[PDB]
Design a protein around this nucleic acid. Structure first.
Ligand SMILES: Nc1nc2c(ncn2[C@H]2CC[C@@H](COP(=O)(O)OP(=O)(O)OP(=O)(O)O)O2)c(=O)[nH]1
Ligand SMILES: [Mg+2]
Ligand SMILES: [Mg+2]
Ligand SMILES: [Mg+2]
Lengths: 105, 662
DNA sequence: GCCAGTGCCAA
DNA sequence: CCTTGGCACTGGC
């Protein structure tokens, strides 16, 4: 139930979505990214209705990340109507993401 | 004989004050110090030695002390001081001849650690005295609380500077006696510290005379400088930079940016298991972050065509499969491989040519304007580049050139070579009286090393090659025979071959394979089979292990052989180097005895010496015609001097600049 | 700034 | 086994 983004689809799918979108900027070569991946797969089911989980691989899609000043991965950016509502870097746990989402939702 | 040294406020280019000097006299066996107000007395002492037909010893005096004293005597005392060349000795020149196999810091200009091999002790200390003095000066001031500025240790005289001056002469005296104790250069029967100048040159090995004369002439050449066109090169820089900006724009358009791990300190460990994963990027577990939540710190990196890693990355991501690699763990990414790289995407395939162009663009930009030794950074107020020359920098007896290297200017037939070469010219110097541009005379020795080969193999073929070699131009005759595109390619081919290049190497030179390599090698070696006999005799003479490590040079010196396979190159490159060295000395001497004066306030001026070629500035075209004729006479003289078995010749060219005179 | 690796520029 | 040399540029400590 994840929306796999591209550079070209990002503007519409994220910045014009009108709702809550959690974008995960990741890379296949990152250790922490592989850790938080399965956690995201579950948050998408639980938060299906009040939030949408999206993923953008910085290798296949190199144009989006620089615009948000990415200095570390995985970068979890919570978008709310084309605006960055909250940013969190690192492989959080199921509980830490749950908190973060509920608090910012 | 006296040993001396001076301390002044700056390098020769801008020196305006004599601080102190020291003189050690062998006849009294005492040291005498001279402070700033004793300048006149110091100068008198040096002339007194000259008046006795004696000798004055300095360590780097030819390039610094001697000219410095002439400049300072006129500025401070309004006196004409001119020590004759024949009364001067330079321990640095002597050390570079005797210890030709070793490197040196070029009087502290070069990083001591970047130099290979060992360094002679006394000379090492002499080359470090200035930096060592700066260290003593800096700490003495920080003890008193005072602050150190730029290079204030040389602004004024002090007793600490005086002490280092006395130490210089004691060390120079020690180095001198260590050099004179070499029985190969100085006969044991003679006490060279107790003879007049005339006896010093006549009794010592011929090489000792040639080296001092070469160093004295080349010091003058440095002071002359090479008239440079700053405006033309600044305009060339704008053109190159504009092309670089465009190449970079298109290249970054085709090859996008990416992220890479950077800054990670912590080891990433398997969550499930626990074993450290050394292949994964280093992480960072914080104290926008959450304590305990790991993350890979990353950097954004833009494509850089000047990197060989980025090109390799991008081209392999496009399908390129590297054939040749480097002994470390990196594919070879040079112009050879780039020219042969084949991908699928037409845009990326086209980008490879932009990369090849960019690399050359950068090569020209770095040498002309941006590099640390760039021409634009080296032009003095007189509108000239005073490149340095180590008269005996190469083991073979060749000279080395640096700051900047005027012996590596791009050739007129290479991209932007005509513009680069045209910027160096006598035309760029306007006469001090008439304001009219000078004329240039470039002379180059014809087929130098091949004629040296003809000489040495004459005992084997009875001068057959020496006769055949002058049947038209050798390089044009070889070019056609070998079916080569250019005469320059024939030169690189013939020397590559002569000096033991493998089949594949000979193939690379000519633009073919190992097959063509073997053909060309045996084709030329069968024509002149005396090459094999010459190589073998060299081996029987040098190798048994080592029977003898050095080769006896044309002037008697020891020429250190580094490797058995480069022994023919040592023999031939040394012969050409010594021939050319005696050639430039004789040329100037003949011009001088013809009434011509050396200097910008005279008739001619040496601007550059690039192995077997000289570029001389001439006040008039008439003078340039004579310099060219005199150089031909001096070469024929050199050949007869050493009884060469092959006639030596030169080719002269008159013109406004280097693009036209070479 | 030092340094290792790579490459090009000239003779 | 091309040789002799200077020097630019990336990327690691
Ligand atoms: N090992 C080696 N030596 C070379 C090479 N090119 C030049 N040399 C040496 C031998 C000749 C000497 C001077 O170079 P030149 O280009 O003047 O050669 P040359 O043979 O005298 O030719 P010319 O008649 O054109 O002046 O430097 C080369 O590629 N390899
Ligand atoms: Mg000195
Ligand atoms: Mg020549
Ligand atoms: Mg030449």
């Amino acid at each position: 139930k994840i929306i796999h983004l591209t550079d070209d689809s990002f503007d519409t799918d994220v910045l014009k979505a009108d709702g809550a979108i959690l974008v995960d900027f990741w890379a296949e070569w990152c250790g922490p990214c592989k850790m938080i991946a399965p956690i995201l797969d579950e948050i998408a089911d639980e938060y299906q209705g009040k939030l949408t989980v999206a993923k953008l691989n910085i290798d296949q899609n190199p144009g989006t990340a620089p615009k948000y000043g990415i200095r570390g991965i995985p970068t979890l950016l919570l978008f709310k109507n084309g605006e960055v509502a909250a940013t969190k870097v690192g492989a959080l746990s199921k509980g830490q993401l749950k908190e973060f989402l509920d608090a910012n939702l | 004989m006296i040993v001396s040294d001076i301390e002044a406020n700056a390098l020769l280019e801008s020196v305006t004050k004599f601080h102190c000097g020291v003189i050690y006299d062998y006849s009294t066996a005492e040291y005498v110090s001279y402070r700033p107000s004793d300048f006149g007395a110091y100068l008198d002492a040096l002339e007194a030695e000259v008046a006795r037909g004696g000798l004055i010893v300095f360590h780097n005096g030819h390039k610094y002390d001697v000219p410095a004293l002439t400049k300072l005597a006129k500025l401070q005392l309004n006196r004409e001081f001119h020590l004759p060349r024949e009364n001067c000795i330079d321990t640095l020149v002597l050390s570079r001849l005797i210890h030709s196999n070793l490197k040196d810091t070029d009087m502290g200009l070069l990083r001591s650690g970047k130099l290979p091999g060992a360094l002679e002790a006394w000379g090492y200390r002499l080359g470090e005295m200035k930096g060592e003095y700066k260290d003593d000066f800096k700490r003495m001031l920080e003890e008193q609380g005072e602050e150190y500025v730029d290079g204030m240790e040389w602004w004024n005289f002090n007793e600490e500077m005086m002490d280092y001056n006395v130490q210089d002469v004691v060390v120079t005296k020690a180095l001198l006696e260590k050099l004179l104790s070499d029985k190969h250069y100085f006969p044991p029967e003679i006490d060279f510290t107790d003879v007049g100048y005339t006896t010093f040159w006549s009794e010592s090995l011929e090489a000792v005379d040639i080296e001092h004369r070469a160093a004295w002439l080349l010091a003058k050449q440095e002071r002359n400088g090479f008239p440079f066109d700053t405006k033309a090169i600044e305009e060339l820089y704008v053109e190159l930079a504009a092309r670089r900006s465009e190449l970079l724009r298109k290249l970054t358009e085709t090859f996008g940016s990416w992220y890479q791990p950077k800054g990670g300190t912590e080891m990433f460990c398997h969550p499930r298991t626990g074993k450290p994963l050394p292949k994964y990027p280093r992480i960072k577990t914080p104290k926008e972050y959450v304590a305990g939540a790991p993350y890979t710190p990353v950097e954004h990196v833009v494509f850089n065509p000047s990197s060989r890693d980025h090109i390799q990355k991008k081209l392999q991501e496009a399908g390129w499969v590297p054939t040749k690699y480097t002994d470390k763990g990196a594919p070879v990414v040079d112009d050879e491989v780039l020219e042969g790289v084949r991908v699928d995407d037409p845009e990326k395939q086209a980008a490879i040519d932009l990369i090849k162009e960019y690399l050359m663009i950068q090569k020209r930009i770095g040498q002309s304007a941006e590099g640390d030794k760039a021409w634009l950074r080296y032009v003095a107020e007189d509108g000239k580049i005073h490149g340095s020359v180590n008269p005996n920098g190469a083991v073979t007896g060749r000279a080395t050139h640096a700051f900047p290297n005027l012996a590596q200017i791009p050739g007129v037939r290479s991209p932007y070579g005509e513009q680069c070469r045209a910027a160096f010219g006598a035309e760029h110097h306007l006469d001090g009286i008439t304001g009219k541009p000078w004329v240039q005379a470039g002379i180059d020795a014809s087929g130098l090393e091949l004629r040296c080969l003809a000489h040495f193999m004459a005992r084997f073929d009875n001068g057959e090659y020496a006769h055949e070699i002058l049947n038209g131009d050798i390089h044009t005759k070889n070019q056609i025979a070998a079916e080569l595109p250019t005469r320059d390619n024939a030169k690189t081919f013939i020397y590559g071959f002569l000096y033991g290049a493998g089949d594949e190497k000979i193939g690379q030179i000519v633009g073919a394979g190992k097959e063509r390599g073997k053909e060309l090698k045996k084709k030329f070696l069968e024509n002149t089979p005396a090459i094999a006999a010459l190589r073998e005799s060299i081996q029987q003479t040098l190798v048994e292990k080592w029977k003898r490590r050095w080769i006896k040079g044309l002037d008697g010196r020891k020429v250190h052989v580094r490797s058995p396979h480069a022994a023919l190159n040592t023999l031939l490159q040394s012969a050409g180097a010594l021939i050319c060295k005696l050639w430039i000395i004789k040329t100037e001497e003949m011009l001088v005895e013809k009434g011509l004066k050396h200097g910008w306030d005279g008739d001619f001026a040496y601007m550059a010496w690039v192995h077997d070629e000289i570029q001389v500035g001439c006040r008039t075209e008439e003078i340039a015609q004579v310099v060219i004729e005199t150089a031909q006479e001096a070469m024929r003289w050199v050949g007869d001097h050493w009884n060469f078995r092959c006639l030596l010749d030169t080719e002269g060219k008159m013109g406004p600049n280097w693009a036209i005179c070479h």
